[PDB]
Structure to design on (2032 residues):
């Protein structure tokens, strides 16, 4: 009945030293029924990464919408959109549906190509921006993620240390949520290289 | 040239020839007048009897707006009716919102802005009427005259139509000979005379006289038609003066 | 009533000319000279304040206008047409960009929006083209400093330096001899003042010349402190005194 | 030659309908003048009542737009009242939306923008009027802003409009060339009105009675027009020195 | 499920201007989403706006009016007035009959002087020398009612404002973390004092949770293509 | 000449040529006569056929139980205007339980015709109408012109050669106004009136159309052998 | 009323021609020449800027060659402002298609859409047509490399080599003379520049008067790359082909 | 809320408390409920604060535009504009407004516009939640053609009792006096009126 | 409507759909074909609210047939499934949403691969080796999870499908009157007339 917990799933993003990480589980379900273990929730437009939790039809729709918009942006601007700018575009787009919203919990992650500064941001379903320095969480196990991140996180982690931190945050949060899990992906993002890692986890 | 073929076009003079041509239709119409008296206004009009078959006293020309304003016009009669219909809508919406009956200067601008609006576009034709109107409000009596251009002013006496020059001269005598003012009953008599005198420009056919008035003492500030004995008295006074 | 002119008033003649656009350009040609020069660390735009009467206060008439904190505009041609275009340009910078991306548009894209408005007056029903050419100077993070010309047709071109209006042919020749890719902003202002003097008949001073720059960020003009990333507008209109100071070193 | 009938460009880049609207401006054969004091803005205009049947109290080309703003018009009365009604509506709306009184220069700009539209849109004709707005603005002080059929507007130290504007303008120019200040250095508005009337008399070379003039005065927080008797008191003071 | 944060927001008038302050906790239900958000916003250079209620509505409404205020300032060639922002905000909010859950304290300076207003989601406005909003408004107002006086100095008003915010921080569960302050004095630039007080610093953890490298089991690695 | 291209253009002498040309269509139309007494009002209309195989174009239209008209000019325009009258008569009865006064009906027709004379795109109506009725103030006869001018009369005629009938009615005025409580004699006067407008042709049984309304007489149209009595 | 001033932009002549379309084509014949040449391993777009100035900022300037998406580009001949209106509409259509089907829009479908928009202005609305002729260079996985042209009538056709703008008669004859089916991109680059060099109304063909682009599968492996040539890169290819 | 308007010999006086509540919390203890729609036409507001402010702002706009065109409006005209807004939008409004004004021709006039959007011209009017407790007192103590000082005392005593019994009313008693002499604001503090 | 199953094997997609149509109290039909051919190599089965199911399916069919004629080209199964998803995603925020769940079984002639897409009435799309809608998956997925192989033949797919239907017939309370089975492969669409 509650649109934000029909399909399940989680996204988490973290900042490190000259790097950002964004991660998500792979589950899509119809309440108790597991439907897909390959439903990735992180997308990218150039060097800007977007994770989206919530109602899966809206996750797909918004990805298609932001691909649409960032493609036109690039043609007109003659450059790739930056994380700060894209964050405002997501916020604007969500608030235009103020009284008929997309039931989602988006998360932006990326590094500004000119300043080199790591950037993350979160949103409620209606466009309110949470621009945290440390970490952003979203999904049906957000409480669990907040608990994991608050204790595990420390600032200025090196890319390969940040990978371990965010992975353990996701995995152990997901294992305490019925509607999350069934696989996981972690993106480690540096100024001009991005590594994607699929994690081994329990499949119940 | 070609500046006179379309409404709202400025000629090289800065003139709107279509409005000036509308005036020609007004000048072609029958004589109508207005006289501002001590506590009100009197309206009178010449009605040409084209044929014996016209039913006497039936084809009424003067029109009431709300209950306190009278309107009379010369030129294209249908255009005048259209303007009065608008005026009645304006007066109704004013009273609806502000409770009080529309003041005469307020009403004058409502007609004025409407007529002026028909000189702004080539998709409409200017009004082929000059309208003499007025009545009594909280500040007293008011008499106005409104032209095809939308131009209007307040008047002591007003005249339009074919015999306007004759009428104006008569009105000017009354203004000079009565600086203190004219009574409502005097104004009715004088109105009858002036229409009879102005009928010399339309001497071919005989006519019917029609008079109305709004007066604070005589009609309680309401517009009423001059009928029966009072009308006959004015006709007699008029007939006596022309002989 | 209703606007019953739903057909184009600008149309192709047998020779392929769009008459109303050509005539709009003729009106621009009669207009007072305005110019723009791009330097390495800034842009300058300038024009003459041709006062219609000495009783008129020409400071109340702004020929050089701020469009965004980092973009400014000047014109040649019909002043009223320019004024309404500035109003539309300011608004479209918000409605079609800042309210979407949370930042001001880059110069080229604002120019593109203004150009689109001018193009539509060339094709839409019951309207004439705008009788102005615009010179738009601006800065943004990824494109740096830039200068654009926009014509009545809606066509726009980027310039290193140019002039429009009355004495544009002579002024452009003057600019060709002086311009190089190593000019500092003060050098461009100096050249602007030299160029503009040739097309001006009467008085030539800070009260008869309007001049603005796109240069360094002005934190003193921001109006507030506390946010490190906000450093103030790059558009700055030179004062009457600031112009006169540079007219002594002329 | 339909480029002369509607507001489209001629081959010379001209708008003839705008130029002919400027000519309609002088159809009333009335001259107006505006000047600024220290605390006030004064506007005077000729008043001609050529018909004895007219009620002279209703013959006016000065309008009270808002409490603070006054407007004199040079041109035919129908277009004048059209502009007056619109200016009143715009000023009232402004106060409702933005919570403060519409400034004189802002109203002028707004009416100038509306005029500009008539010069670009074919279905609307220009109004054959020149509008001179006056006030004592709470930020800018005494203000004179004038609008014309081209959609042009600008602030003035002083200004004149009508068939004999040039004579009045030069007269005013010569005075401000002497004084070297942007206003009439006078405390009371009464004396600023006296200055205005005196310099119109000098420029036009005609004497005025109380019924030959029309006067509007703007002070802080109100604009008002003078009665015939107020003007008479002014004329007496002028004659007595 | 939209953000509605707990907050303590206050506004205090003084000698030559006005000051506003706020806490820095953003809540999601009982969960603290952001431990250092910025609740003080700009409408114009010298007009600032503290917001509470539905977080998305406060930000959105402050930015929209701020945008229209900038265009209005450019159109009129005048610095924007607080009453303009007030009138535009309340007419917007009233049109939506409270469905835009924005509750604001507006404060600033302009040519007319210094001003302090509050706006409620349904479109009502109030005037005052001292005001408070948010879940910690009662805690803050208790302090304001105890210590406020007429003719406050700049330094006194900052002290009173931050003391009112602190009352909310400690006693209201919706409010916490730091104290932001913005001072708007007449004839001067407005000074935003981000994290003016930081009395809630996280203590050193008893243990480091840095994992040995290789702890997490991995199924697949792959290089992602971000370039064209 | 240069000023007759549309209804929105005055001539230099202040004339509206499109309206005048619409008036000309009435003059080409077949003659119809209207006259009344104090108890009854009568319409008489000479119907026109296309040829000997064709029917005779109907001229008289009923608008209500107490009101109707006859037409001369463009028949489709009469259908539009008579339909409008039917609606207005009907609105008055339904909303106010009130029979529409004939004079008010004339005012409504005037205003409807006027709007077509002051706007671009439209055209004036090309038909003249003679409206008869019996209301709370007795019998009435109206003449409608598509200029908008509506006139209340004792008697009149419109169409080709209508001047002959109009002169006759002007002579007979004092006689026919007194024909009270005698429908047949009032119709006789109308049939004699319309006869003053005939040339070459005479009134036959499918040529003549008569209508009557009065004190205790609903608006009824007589055609065919019902008018043989009056031939 | 208003009818008096109506030019009637959408009427046939007695000969059955559309006046405004014909006159718009006359306008386009004075625009700078644009040339498209299709090869087996890619497409070349070459176009001449109109009598330029030394003060024109060339490296940031674009009047001829525009990107519609990653696979499709256009060369413009006519009113640049009119072209940009249509270009933005085309860019939106491409994205609409991509959102709907999750596949890049086939070249012809985009071309047909833009051409239908042009057609509408010749049949209804009473507005003047767009004074623009496009050369569309594009790639999709159905037909591979494709060249199209459209003009103000809304009519479009496919080509192996084509020119629009000024001196098309001379240009088309030269292309028809030297074009062969087994031609390669590097050969097509040379043909395009040689054709412009001969047909130009200027005294000599230099880098500052040209815009140049290639669509190649010279993108590493099974994909397509668009290359809008920089001023220095146009200068180099002019030296390479032996024109300067 | 406790509001009233009373006509007297020299014109009319409007009175009001200053308490604005959200449930049992006093959101504003120094509210100004006496609002100016024209120079000498004021009103007292009760009901939804958002609604009555919105209505008052619209009326002020209407009377400002009226004045520019037709000169000073009557109090009846102002009441009519209020009524038009309240009646036509009765489904979406909770507003109880007392309109008070001074003309030179009509002198002091009071109109009350209750919830339904009807109008009632009265010698004096009371409204708001606190008014219920003073119907008895006001009816017994009101006289026509009182002096300024008597009317101030009548309003002060009346609103004192309304405040005493009504929890939704309190703070200061504000008053606005409308006469030919001009517009005078008065304020009375708790220590003054509580001992009455 | 009730049970609709799909399974993608090595070289084909197999769709199984129940034959029963029940209007409350009575089973009105026991031979209903809950499927539409969208293009020669694309088949769509459907289940949901009465009336809306067929109305939606035929509306989609008409649109794909229109595209096929306009372009003289068959859209890929992926492209068709995306078009269908958008229509359902559009529909869910309409005045009255289509209450329709679909399976799209297609053979991509370009890639030479079978493809099965599962889309619910919200516009929730997933590409799967096997899928279902409603309660069908609850009974059948444990069997499919166990036996499914990506290299299965069409005959093995049909045998695994029979086991699924047998489990449905055993444990489901409703009598769905058997299933109509259709196969989509490189040669197009055909119906298994004995099942
Ligand atoms: Cl404007
Ligand atoms: Mg789990
Ligand atoms: Mg499980
Ligand atoms: Mg025009
Ligand atoms: Mg109490």
């Amino acid at each position: 009945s509650d649109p934000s917990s029909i399909n399940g799933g989680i996204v988490v993003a973290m900042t490190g030293k000259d790097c950002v990480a964004i991660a998500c589980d792979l589950r899509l379900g119809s309440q108790s029924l597991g439907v897909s273990n390959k439903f990735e929730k992180i997308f990218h437009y150039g060097h800007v990464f977007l994770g989206i939790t919530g109602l899966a039809t809206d996750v797909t729709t918004l990805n298609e919408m932001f691909r649409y918009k960032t493609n036109l942006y690039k043609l007109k601007e003659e450059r790739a959109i930056e994380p700060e700018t894209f964050t405002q575009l997501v916020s604007s787009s969500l608030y235009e549906r103020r009284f008929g919203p997309y039931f989602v919990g988006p998360v932006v992650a990326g590094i500004n190509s000119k300043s080199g500064k790591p950037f993350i941001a979160g949103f409620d379903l209606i466009g309110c921006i949470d621009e945290a320095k440390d970490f952003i969480v979203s999904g049906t196990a957000s409480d669990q993620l907040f608990g994991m991140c608050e204790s595990l996180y420390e600032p200025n982690l090196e890319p390969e240390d940040l990978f371990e931190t965010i992975s353990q945050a996701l995995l152990n949060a997901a294992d305490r949520d019925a509607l999350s899990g069934w696989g996981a992906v972690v993106y480690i993002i540096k100024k001009d290289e991005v590594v994607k890692r699929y994690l081994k986890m329990r499949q119940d | 040239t070609g500046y006179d073929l379309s409404n709202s076009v400025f000629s090289p003079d800065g003139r709107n020839f279509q409005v000036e041509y509308a005036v020609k239709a007004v000048e072609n119409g029958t004589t109508s007048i207005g006289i501002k008296c001590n506590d009100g206004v009197v309206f009178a009009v010449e009605k040409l009897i084209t044929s014996k078959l016209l039913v006497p006293q039936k084809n009424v020309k003067i029109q009431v707006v709300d209950r306190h304003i009278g309107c009379v016009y010369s030129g294209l009669i249908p255009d005048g009716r259209h303007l009065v219909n608008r005026g009645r809508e304006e007066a109704a919406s004013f009273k609806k919102l502000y409770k009080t009956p529309i003041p005469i200067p307020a009403f004058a601008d409502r007609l004025g802005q409407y007529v002026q609006a028909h000189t702004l576009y080539n998709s409409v034709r200017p009004f082929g009427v000059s309208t003499i109107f007025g009545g009594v409000d909280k500040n007293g009596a008011h008499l106005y005259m409104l032209e095809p251009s939308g131009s209007y002013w307040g008047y002591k006496g007003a005249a339009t139509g074919k015999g306007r020059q004759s009428a104006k001269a008569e009105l000017e005598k009354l203004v000079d000979h009565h600086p203190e003012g004219l009574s409502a009953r005097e104004a009715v008599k004088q109105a009858a005379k002036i229409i009879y005198l102005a009928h010399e420009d339309n001497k071919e056919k005989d006519f019917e006289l029609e008079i109305s008035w709004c007066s604070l003492s005589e009609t309680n500030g309401l517009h009423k038609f001059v009928k029966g004995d009072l009308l006959q008295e004015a006709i007699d006074f008029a007939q006596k003066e022309i002989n | 009533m209703t606007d019953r002119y739903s057909f184009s008033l600008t149309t192709f003649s047998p020779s392929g000319k769009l008459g109303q656009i050509d005539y709009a350009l003729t009106a621009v040609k009669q207009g007072v000279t305005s110019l723009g020069i791009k330097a390495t660390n800034g842009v300058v735009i300038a024009t003459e304040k041709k006062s219609s009467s000495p009783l008129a206060m020409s400071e109340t008439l702004s020929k050089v206008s701020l469009l965004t904190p980092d973009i400014g505009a000047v014109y040649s041609g019909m002043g009223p047409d320019y004024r309404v275009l500035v109003d539309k340009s300011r608004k479209v910078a918000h409605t079609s960009y800042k309210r979407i991306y949370g930042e001001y548009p880059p110069t080229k894209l604002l120019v593109s929006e203004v150009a689109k408005i001018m193009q539509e007056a060339t094709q839409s029903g019951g309207v004439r083209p705008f009788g102005v050419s615009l010179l738009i100077a601006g800065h943004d993070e990824f494109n740096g400093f830039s200068l654009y010309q926009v014509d009545p047709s809606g066509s726009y071109f980027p310039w290193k330096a140019t002039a429009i209006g009355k004495g544009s042919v002579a002024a452009k020749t003057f600019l060709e001899k002086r311009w190089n890719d190593e000019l500092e902003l003060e050098d461009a202002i100096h050249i602007a003042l030299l160029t503009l003097k040739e097309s001006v008949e009467g008085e030539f001073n800070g009260d008869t010349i309007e001049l603005a720059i796109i240069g360094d960020e002005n934190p003193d003009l921001l109006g507030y402190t506390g946010i490190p990333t906000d450093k103030g507008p790059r558009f700055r209109k030179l004062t009457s005194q600031e112009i006169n100071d540079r007219l002594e070193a002329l | 030659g339909y480029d002369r009938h509607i507001t489209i460009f001629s081959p010379e880049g001209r708008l003839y309908q705008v130029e002919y609207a400027f000519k309609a401006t002088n159809q009333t054969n009335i001259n107006s003048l505006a000047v600024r004091g220290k605390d006030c803005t004064v506007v005077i205009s000729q008043k001609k009542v050529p018909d004895k049947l007219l009620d002279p109290t209703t013959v006016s080309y000065i309008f009270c737009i808002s409490r603070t703003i006054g407007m004199v018009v040079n041109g035919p009365i129908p277009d004048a009242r059209n502009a007056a009604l619109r200016a009143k509506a715009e000023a009232a709306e402004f106060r409702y939306k933005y919570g403060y009184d519409m400034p004189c220069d802002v109203l002028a700009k707004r009416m100038a923008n509306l005029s500009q539209i008539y010069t670009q849109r074919a279905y609307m004709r220009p109004l054959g009027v020149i509008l001179t707005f006056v006030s004592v603005d709470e930020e800018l002080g005494p203000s004179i802003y004038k609008t014309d059929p081209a959609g042009y507007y600008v602030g003035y130290k002083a200004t004149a409009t009508g068939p004999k504007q040039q004579e009045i303008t030069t007269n005013l120019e010569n005075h401000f060339k002497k004084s070297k200040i942007d206003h009439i250095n006078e405390e009371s508005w009464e004396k600023v009105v006296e200055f205005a009337i005196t310099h119109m008399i000098d420029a036009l070379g005609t004497e005025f009675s109380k019924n030959d003039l029309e006067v509007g005065v703007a002070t802080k927080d109100k604009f008002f027009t003078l009665s015939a008797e107020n003007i008479e008191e002014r004329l007496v003071a002028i004659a007595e020195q | 499920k939209a953000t509605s944060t707990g907050a303590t927001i206050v506004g205090v008038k003084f000698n030559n201007g006005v000051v506003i302050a706020a806490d820095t906790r953003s809540t999601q239900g009982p969960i603290v989403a952001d431990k250092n958000c910025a609740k003080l916003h700009r409408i114009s250079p010298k007009i600032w706006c503290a917001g509470a209620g539905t977080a998305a509505d406060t930000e959105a409404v402050t930015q929209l009016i701020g945008s229209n205020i900038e265009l209005h300032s450019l159109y009129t060639s005048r610095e924007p007035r607080v009453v303009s922002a007030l009138q535009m905000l309340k007419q917007h909010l009233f049109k939506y009959q409270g469905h835009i859950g924005a509750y604001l304290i507006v404060a600033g300076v302009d040519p007319t002087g210094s001003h302090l207003f509050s706006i409620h989601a349904h479109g009502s406005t109030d005037v005052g020398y001292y005001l408070s909003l948010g879940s910690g408004s009662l805690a803050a107002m208790a302090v304001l009612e105890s210590h406020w006086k007429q003719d406050l100095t700049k330094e006194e008003a900052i002290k009173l404002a931050s003391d009112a915010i602190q009352a909310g921080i400690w006693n209201d569960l919706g409010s916490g973390s730091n104290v932001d302050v913005c001072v708007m004095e007449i004839g001067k630039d407005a000074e935003y004092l981000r994290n003016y007080l930081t009395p809630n610093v996280r203590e050193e953890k008893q243990k480091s949770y840095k994992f040995p490298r290789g702890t997490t089991a991995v199924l697949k690695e792959s290089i992602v293509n971000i370039c064209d | 000449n240069n000023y007759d291209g549309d209804t929105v253009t005055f001539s230099p002498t202040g004339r509206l040529f499109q309206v005048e040309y619409a008036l000309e269509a009435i003059k080409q139309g077949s003659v119809t006569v209207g006259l009344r007494s104090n108890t009854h009002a009568v319409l008489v209309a000479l119907k026109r056929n296309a040829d000997e195989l064709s029917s005779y174009q109907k001229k008289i239209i009923k608008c209500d139980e107490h009101m109707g008209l006859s037409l001369a000019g463009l028949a489709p325009d009469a259908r539009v205007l008579s339909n409008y009258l039917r609606q207005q008569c009907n609105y008055s009865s339904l909303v106010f339980n009130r029979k529409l006064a004939v004079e008010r009906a004339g005012h409504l027709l005037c205003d409807k015709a006027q709007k077509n004379t002051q706007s671009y795109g439209g055209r004036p109506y090309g038909v003249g109408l003679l409206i008869i009725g019996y209301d709370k103030s007795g019998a009435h006869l109206l003449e409608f012109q598509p200029s908008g001018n509506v006139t209340e009369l004792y008697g009149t005629a419109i169409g080709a050669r209508s001047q002959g009938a109009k002169t006759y009615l002007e002579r007979t005025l004092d006689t026919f106004i007194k024909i009270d409580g005698n429908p047949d004699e009032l119709i006789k006067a109308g049939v004699e009136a319309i006869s003053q407008s005939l040339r070459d042709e005479s009134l036959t049984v499918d040529n003549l159309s008569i209508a009557i309304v009065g004190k205790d007489t609903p608006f009824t149209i007589y055609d065919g052998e019902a008018v043989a009595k009056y031939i | 009323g208003s009818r008096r001033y109506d030019s009637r932009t959408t009427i046939f002549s007695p000969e059955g021609r559309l006046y405004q379309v014909e006159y718009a084509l006359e306008s386009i014949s004075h625009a700078g020449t644009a040339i498209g040449i299709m090869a087996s391993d890619g497409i070349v777009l070459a176009a001449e800027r109109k009598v330029t100035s030394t003060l024109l900022e060339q490296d940031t300037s674009t009047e001829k060659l525009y990107k519609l998406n990653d696979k499709i580009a256009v060369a413009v001949a006519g009113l640049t402002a009119d072209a940009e209106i249509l270009i933005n509409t085309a860019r939106i259509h491409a994205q609409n298609y991509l959102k709907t089907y999750n596949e890049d829009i086939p070249v012809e479908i985009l071309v047909r859409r833009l051409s239908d928009i042009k057609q509408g202005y010749t049949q209804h609305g009473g507005l003047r047509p767009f004074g623009v002729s496009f050369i569309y260079a594009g790639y999709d996985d159905r037909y591979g490399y494709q060249l199209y042209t459209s003009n103000p009538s809304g009519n479009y056709t496919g080509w192996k080599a084509i020119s629009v703008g000024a001196n098309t008669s001379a240009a088309q004859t030269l292309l028809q003379m030297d074009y062969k089916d087994d031609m390669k991109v590097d050969d097509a680059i040379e043909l395009a520049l040689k054709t412009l060099s001969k047909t130009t109304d200027s005294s000599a063909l230099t880098y500052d008067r040209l815009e140049f682009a290639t669509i190649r599968k010279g993108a590493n492996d099974g994909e397509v790359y668009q290359k809008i040539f920089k001023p220095q890169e146009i200068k180099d290819i002019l030296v390479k082909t032996g024109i300067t | 809320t406790s509001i009233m308007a009373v006509t007297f010999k020299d014109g009319v006086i409007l009175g009001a408390d200053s308490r604005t509540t959200t449930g049992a919390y006093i959101a504003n203890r120094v509210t100004d409920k006496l609002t100016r729609v024209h120079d000498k036409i004021w009103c007292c507001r009760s009901g939804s604060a958002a609604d009555t402010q919105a209505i008052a702002d619209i009326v002020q706009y209407h009377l400002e535009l009226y004045t520019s065109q037709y000169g000073t409006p009557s109090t009846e005209t102002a009441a009519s504009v209020f009524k038009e807004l309240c009646y036509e939008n009765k489904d979406n409004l909770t507003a109880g407004i007392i309109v008070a004004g001074y003309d030179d021709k009509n002198k002091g006039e009071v109109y009350t516009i209750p919830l339904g959007g009807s109008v009632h011209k009265l010698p004096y009017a009371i409204a708001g939640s606190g008014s219920t407790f003073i119907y008895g007192y006001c009816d017994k103590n009101f006289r026509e053609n009182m002096s300024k000082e008597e009317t101030v005392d009548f309003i002060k005593h009346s609103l004192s009792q309304a405040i005493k019994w009504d929890g939704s009313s309190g703070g200061v008693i504000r008053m606005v006096v409308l006469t030919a002499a001009g517009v005078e604001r008065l304020i009375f503090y708790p220590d003054e009126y509580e001992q009455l | 409507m009730d049970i609709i199953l799909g399974i993608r094997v090595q070289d084909s997609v197999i769709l199984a759909s129940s034959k029963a149509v029940t209007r409350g109290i009575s089973v009105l039909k026991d031979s209903d074909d809950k499927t539409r051919q969208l293009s020669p190599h694309t088949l769509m089965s459907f289940a949901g609210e009465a009336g809306d199911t067929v109305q939606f399916a035929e509306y989609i069919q008409a649109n794909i047939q229109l595209y096929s004629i306009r372009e003289d080209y068959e859209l890929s199964p992926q492209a068709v499934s995306s078009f269908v998803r958008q229509e359902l995603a559009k529909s869910i925020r309409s005045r009255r949403p289509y209450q329709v769940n679909v399976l799209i079984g297609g053979y991509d002639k370009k890639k030479n691969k079978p493809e099965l897409y599962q889309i619910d009435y919200l516009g929730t799309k997933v590409e799967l080796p096997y899928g279902a809608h409603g309660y069908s998956g609850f009974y059948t997925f444990s069997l499919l999870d166990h036996h499914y192989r990506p290299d299965m033949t069409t005959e093995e797919g049909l045998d695994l499908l029979k086991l699924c239907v047998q489990e449905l017939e055993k444990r489901m309370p409703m009598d769905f009157k058997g299933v109509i089975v259709k196969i989509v492969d490189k040669d197009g669409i055909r119906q298994v007339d004995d099942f």
In short: The radius of gyration of chain E is 20 Å. Chains E and F do not touch (no CB pair under 8 Å). The pocket of magnesium ion (ligand 2) is lined by residues A 174-175, 177, 180-181 (CB under 6 Å). Residues 55 and 125 of chain E are 19 Å apart (CA to CA).
